[PDB]
Amino acid sequence: GTACSCGNSKGIYWFYRPSCPTDRGYTGSCRYFLGTCCTPAD
Secondary structure, eight states: OOEEEETTEEEEEEESOOOOOGGGTOOEEEEETTEEEEEOOO
């Protein structure tokens, strides 16, 4: 998986995908170099 971390939140970042499915319990959303970083705590 495309791992991404925001402080303490750990999740997955999507490549150029402006559509982050928040139904996966995503807590935060950060800008990762290659796309949208959707971070819950995985």
